[PDB]
Amino acid sequence: AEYDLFISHASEDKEDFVRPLAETLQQLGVNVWYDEFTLKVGDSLRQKIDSGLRNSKYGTVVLSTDFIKKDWTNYELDGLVAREMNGHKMILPIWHKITKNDVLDYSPNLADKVALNTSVNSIEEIAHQLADVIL
Structure with a gap:
């Protein structure tokens, strides 16, 4: 693998x-x-x-x-945020500018799969969680 990490995201958050x-x-x-x-x-x-x-x-x-409103299979995110392929792993999903009603409406099973949250966690805290696993 040429890269340590890729970040899936919507354009609004880029x-x-x-x-x-x-x-x-x-x-x-x-x-x-x-x-x-x-x-x-x-x-x-x-x-x-x-x-x-x-x-x-x-x-x-x-x-x-x-x-989550752009994701055509948003209701299946609970499987996708932990998906692995060729030994490479989706890890540490990040709540960012989302409402609980949005989770209830478009992906209810995702609720206890995610811990990081940019309204409670700083960018630096989130980066350290990723860095500690990668390095």
């Missing part, structure tokens, strides 16, 4: 969250990329995930209201 998080991860020594894994409306998410896991040791998902 510049104001994924980019600072990626830069923080790079400062900690993690080789991370994300530009090719932006989810737009009508995209196949699993297509992006298969590409990410093919060339990255790990992946994570930025679970926003925008992301």
Whole structure:
């Protein structure tokens, strides 16, 4: 794998969250990329995930209201946020700009699968969780 980590995300969260998080991860020594894994409306998410896991040791998902309403199989995120392929692992999903009603409406089984939350956890705390596993 050429990369340590890829970050699946919606376009609404790319510049104001994924980019600072990626830069923080790079400062900690993690080789991370994300530009090719932006989810737009009508995209196949699993297509992006298969590409990410093919060339990255790990992946994570930025679970926003925008992301979960764009995900055609949002109700199956509870399986996807822990998906593995070729020994590469989706890990540490991140709650980010999402409401509990959004989880109840579009992916109820996801609720106890996620712990990180950018409304309670800082970007630096989240980056350290990823960095400690990767390095």
